[PDB]
Enzyme design. Structure first.
Site, PDB file in Angstrom:
ATOM      1  N   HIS A  41       0.820  -1.232   0.000  1.00  0.00           N
ATOM      2  CA  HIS A  41       0.000   0.000   0.000  1.00  0.00           C
ATOM      3  C   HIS A  41       0.851   1.279   0.000  1.00  0.00           C
ATOM      4  CE1 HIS A  41       0.303  -0.032   4.527  1.00  0.00           C
ATOM      5  NE2 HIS A  41       0.409   1.262   4.285  1.00  0.00           N
ATOM      6  N   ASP A  88      -0.113  -7.625   1.705  1.00  0.00           N
ATOM      7  CA  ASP A  88       0.322  -6.219   1.681  1.00  0.00           C
ATOM      8  C   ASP A  88       1.847  -6.172   1.787  1.00  0.00           C
ATOM      9  OD1 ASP A  88       0.306  -3.454   1.673  1.00  0.00           O
ATOM     10  OD2 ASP A  88      -0.560  -3.262   3.700  1.00  0.00           O
ATOM     11  N   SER A 173       3.959   2.567   8.421  1.00  0.00           N
ATOM     12  CA  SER A 173       3.693   1.626   7.303  1.00  0.00           C
ATOM     13  C   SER A 173       4.992   1.134   6.680  1.00  0.00           C
ATOM     14  CB  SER A 173       2.874   2.277   6.184  1.00  0.00           C
ATOM     15  OG  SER A 173       1.500   2.258   6.473  1.00  0.00           O
ATOM     16  N   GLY A 174       5.067  -0.180   6.448  1.00  0.00           N
ATOM     17  CA  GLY A 174       6.185  -0.761   5.698  1.00  0.00           C
ATOM     18  C   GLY A 174       7.379  -1.140   6.566  1.00  0.00           C
TER      19      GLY A 174
END
Ligand SMILES: *[C@@H]1O[C@H](CO[C@@H]2O[C@@H](C)[C@@H](O)[C@@H](O)[C@@H]2O)[C@@H](O)[C@H](O)[C@H]1NC(C)=O
Ligand SMILES: *[C@@H]1O[C@H](CO[C@@H]2O[C@@H](C)[C@@H](O)[C@@H](O)[C@@H]2O)[C@@H](O)[C@H](O)[C@H]1NC(C)=O
Lengths: 218, 50
Positions: A41, A88, A173-174
């Site tokens: 994402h 994801d 995120s990530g």
């Protein structure tokens, strides 16, 4: 990261900052000298040609000589579902190979299919929000978390901080989740806002993708 | 302007500071579609009941 602590400089030399226009937007993990992995994402709706991959960073607000910067050359995804944030995970091949040193090192991954049980102690990290808002972290943050299976999908690895409000937050995120020295998660999503005290934080389950990762990086 | 119907419920929110959006209001969507926040950013989606 809400409710965590500052990392010692370069404590996690596989930790990566993905940047657009010189600003951090997502974390990532160095998995070979010329490959990183992050959340699908993160890159789904940005110009991949504009992304800068920053290795060896600690304080995003300072000029740091320890940094090595790359562009993305190639993208690999394995069934990313943006509606439900399933699978994801993205692998980004770099336009060169990192020099491996004290501050830039490759992460270690678990075996294919390894599932962690309730109570396993892990470490989350990232340059996301500190919460208050105390704003975004300049210095890389880390946080002790516990794996939970309740209120988690089988398609995720989830964590919850025991007995207080702490957790991953926007900008994380990530970023990797490290369990017993291995990268078991990639930060994906929260529920009820950051550090709700109720909803576990959800990570892409790296172990489910190891054969696929190896098929690219090996 | 805002259109009739409701946005679908979502399960959670991606950990980006500013998830990219493809719309900012319902009028930017075709027919009866509404501009709704998904798990990661806004998109034009069919409405659900109000
Ligand atoms: C690898 O890429 C480095 C960064 O390139 C710069 O950032 C990207 C996102 C584009 O905007 C590009 O036009 C910029 O130059 C380069 O500095 C480096 O030389 C590249 N290495 C190679 C060619 O092996
Ligand atoms: C907090 O966590 C510290 C680091 O945890 C260990 O190392 C990380 C990188 C992961 O591999 C994780 O699974 C390991 O447990 C510990 O050194 C420290 O003891 C923890 N603090 C408390 C209160 O137990």
């Amino acid at each position: 990261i809400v409710g965590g602590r500052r990392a010692r400089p370069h404590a996690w030399p596989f930790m990566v900052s993905l940047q657009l226009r010189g600003g951090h937007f997502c974390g990532a993990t160095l998995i070979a000298p010329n490959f990183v992995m992050s959340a699908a994402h993160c890159v789904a709706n940005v110009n991949v040609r504009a992304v800068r991959v920053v290795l060896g960073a600690h304080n995003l607000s300072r000029r740091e000589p320890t940094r090595q910067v790359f562009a993305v050359q190639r993208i690999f995804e394995n069934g990313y579902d943006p509606v439900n944030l399933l699978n994801d995970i993205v692998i980004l091949q770099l336009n060169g190979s990192a020099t491996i040193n004290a501050n830039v090192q490759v992460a270690q991954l678990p075996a294919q299919g390894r599932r962690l049980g309730n109570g396993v102690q892990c470490l989350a990290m990232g340059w996301g929000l500190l919460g208050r808002n105390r704003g975004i972290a300049s210095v890389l943050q880390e946080l002790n978390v516990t794996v939970v299976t309740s209120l988690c999908r089988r398609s995720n690895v989830c964590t919850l901080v025991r007995g207080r409000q702490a957790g991953v937050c926007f900008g994380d995120s990530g970023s990797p989740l490290v369990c017993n020295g291995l990268i078991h998660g990639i930060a994906s999503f929260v529920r009820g806002g950051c550090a709700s005290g109720l909803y576990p934080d959800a990570f892409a389950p790296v172990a489910q993708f190891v054969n696929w990762i190896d098929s690219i990086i090996q | 302007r805002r259109k009739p119907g409701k946005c679908p419920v979502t399960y959670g929110q991606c950990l980006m500071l500013n998830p990219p959006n493809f719309c900012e209001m319902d009028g930017q969507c075709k027919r009866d579609l509404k501009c709704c926040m998904g798990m990661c950013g806004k998109s034009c989606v069919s409405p659900v009941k109000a």
